Amino acid sequence: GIKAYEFIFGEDYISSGGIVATTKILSDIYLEPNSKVLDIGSGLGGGCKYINEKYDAHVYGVDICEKMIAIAKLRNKDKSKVEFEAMDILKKDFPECTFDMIYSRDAILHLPYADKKKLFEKCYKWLKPNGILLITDYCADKIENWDEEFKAYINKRKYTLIPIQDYGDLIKSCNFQNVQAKDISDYWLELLQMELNKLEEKKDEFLKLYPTDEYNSLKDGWTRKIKDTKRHLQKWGYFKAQKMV
Amino acid sequence: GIKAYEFIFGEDYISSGGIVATTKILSDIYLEPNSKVLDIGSGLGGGCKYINEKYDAHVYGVDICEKMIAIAKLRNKDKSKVEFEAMDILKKDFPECTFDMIYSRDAILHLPYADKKKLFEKCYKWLKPNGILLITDYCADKIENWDEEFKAYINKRKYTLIPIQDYGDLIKSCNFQNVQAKDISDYWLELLQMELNKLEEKKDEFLKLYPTDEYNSLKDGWTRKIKDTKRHLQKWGYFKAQKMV
Numbered sequence: 001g002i003k004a005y006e007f008i009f010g011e012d013y014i015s016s017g018g019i020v021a022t023t024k025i026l027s028d029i030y031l032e033p034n035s036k037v038l039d040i041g042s043g044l045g046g047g048c049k050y051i052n053e054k055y056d057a058h059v060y061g062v063d064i065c066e067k068m069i070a071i072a073k074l075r076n077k078d079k080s081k082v083e084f085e086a087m088d089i090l091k092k093d094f095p096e097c098t099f100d101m102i103y104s105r106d107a108i109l110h111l112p113y114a115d116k117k118k119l120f121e122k123c124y125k126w127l128k129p130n131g132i133l134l135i136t137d138y139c140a141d142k143i144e145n146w147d148e149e150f151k152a153y154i155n156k157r158k159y160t161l162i163p164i165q166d167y168g169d170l171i172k173s174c175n176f177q178n179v180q181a182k183d184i185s186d187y188w189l190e191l192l193q194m195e196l197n198k199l200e201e202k203k204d205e206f207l208k209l210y211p212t213d214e215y216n217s218l219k220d221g222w223t224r225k226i227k228d229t230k231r232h233l234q235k236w237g238y239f240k241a242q243k244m245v
Numbered sequence: 246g247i248k249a250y251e252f253i254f255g256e257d258y259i260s261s262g263g264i265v266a267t268t269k270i271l272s273d274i275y276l277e278p279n280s281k282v283l284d285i286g287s288g289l290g291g292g293c294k295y296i297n298e299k300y301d302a303h304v305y306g307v308d309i310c311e312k313m314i315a316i317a318k319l320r321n322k323d324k325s326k327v328e329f330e331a332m333d334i335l336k337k338d339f340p341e342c343t344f345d346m347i348y349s350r351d352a353i354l355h356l357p358y359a360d361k362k363k364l365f366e367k368c369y370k371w372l373k374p375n376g377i378l379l380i381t382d383y384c385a386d387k388i389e390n391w392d393e394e395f396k397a398y399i400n401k402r403k404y405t406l407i408p409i410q411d412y413g414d415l416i417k418s419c420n421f422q423n424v425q426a427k428d429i430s431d432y433w434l435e436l437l438q439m440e441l442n443k444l445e446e447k448k449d450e451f452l453k454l455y456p457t458d459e460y461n462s463l464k465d466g467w468t469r470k471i472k473d474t475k476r477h478l479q480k481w482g483y484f485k486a487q488k489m490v
């Protein structure tokens with residue numbers, strides 16, 4: 001229905017396709033084509049498009065949301081080197097040693113604990129010798145600050161949040177080496193403000209395309225996220241590891 | 246982008262999925278299962294859904310608009326019996342004698358004259374003996390009433406309009422038997438009015454989902470169409486024929 005599409009596109013507009021964060025996160029990543037890359041939680045395909053353009057790598061985007069996959073395919077028709085599939089990544093199987101990089105931006109919070117482990121084991125199998133695992137995800141921080149409105153928000157969206165430390169260790173337990181686990185919450189805050197800023201600046205143009213209710217919902221939502229981060233309820237985690245085989 | 250989707254869903258809302266006209270047009274059509282049916286210009290798939298529900302027919306929907314096909318697929322999962330494909334019907338090939346009925350609602354105006362004929366020749370081939378061809382389409386009427394605003398509207402949308410009489414003769418020239426060609430413009434006005442009435446009645450609800458600009462565009466658009474029809478610029482044509490035994 002129209003409501004789901006409207007929120008998908010409205011969020012894409014305010015995040016400017018997510019291109020700022022992707023750019024920075026891949027700024028020190030080096031691939032030689034024709035590398036093969038998997039993007040877990042590929043959304044509207046922006047990260048896949050960018051990775052292909054920057055590296056001329058084959059990119060395979062998986063997302064559980066069929067609407068988004070449909071849009072992604074439509075946005076990236078010509079490029080034979082970019083592929084998309086609608087499926088729960090937990091139900092995917094790829095051959096051993098298929099990928100040079102497996103990349104995932106803010107998708108893994110959607111998995112319960114055992115399922116996070118299950119995915120990382122899969123990722124280990126699917127990577128080529130020397131392959132890299134590259135992830136951002138939301139992590140638990142000051143649970144002593146967690147309150148009734150926060151818990152109900154996470155419970156409702158079905159997020160499963162863990163500390164950066166435990167996350168890094170969980171990856172390490174799947175045989176990954178060179179495991180790096182960094183708090184990038186300061187950068188998260190900066191991205192969030194820039195996105196709220198864009199929304200407020202462009203309110204009039206936004207309303208030509210989106211109903212007033214959505215503008216208000218997104219403004220209030222971004223405002224809450226910024227407040228959540230400033231209160232240190234959660235950290236944005238950055239993780240990089242390598243399959244050394 | 247969002248604008249294209251918004252107009253697709255907004256028009257689907259005001260026409261209530263096309264249910265009313267589809268129900269009437271098929272009221273004296275009898276099929277036994279498991280008939281096969283082709284819907285040319287299937288849009289969001291509502292006609293396909295209805296035909297499968299009413300007859301337990303296998304239905305194959307073709308539309309040139311990939312966005313609509315994508316939505317149609319998502320709206321109709323379980324029904325193994327309903328299939329969709331994004332393609333120009335002119336580029337499609339089916340084995341001879343595949344279908345019990347070929348059905349098309351307000352699509353063929355999108356085809357230039359030679360292409361209309363090519364399509365009907367294809368339809369003749371694709372039908373089983375005694376198979377039914379069932380079409381509604383917009384036809385030219387009082388061309389002495391056409392003015393610069395009407396000409397520019399059709400030239401811009403790339404419509405090719407011909408008189409009901411010539412349309413009927415064209416179908417006959419492809420070997421179809423028992424060709425019926427009827428003016429249903431009275432019925433067309435009644436549908437248009439009801440759709441405009443729905444839009445005006447539900448303005449406040451419509452605006453929770455659609456931008457104010459779309460409401461105005463659709464209201465003015467439906468107002469124009471009603472005006473065009475009353476001025477007898479065009480007729481809504483009904484055509485039914487059968488392949489010879």
Ligand SMILES: C[S@@+](CC[C@H](N)C(=O)[O-])C[C@H]1O[C@@H](n2cnc3c(N)ncnc32)[C@H](O)[C@@H]1O
Nearest residue numbers: 018041042043063064065088089105106107110
């Ligand atoms: C917030 S988004 C981020 C994706 C976006 N392309 C970006 O720039 O990060 C998280 C995505 O992960 C997808 N997702 C959630 N659970 C998933 C699963 N089990 N398998 C695959 N994708 C999933 C969601 O549909 C959503 O599109």
Ligand SMILES: C[S@@+](CC[C@H](N)C(=O)[O-])C[C@H]1O[C@@H](n2cnc3c(N)ncnc32)[C@H](O)[C@@H]1O
Nearest residue numbers: 286287288307308309310333334350351352355
């Ligand atoms: C006004 S719509 C009606 C759609 C659907 N029959 C209905 O009644 O809702 C006409 C449809 O024909 C489709 N169409 C136009 N040219 C076509 C072609 N060459 N092949 C297949 N579909 C086409 C358009 O995309 C559009 O969805």
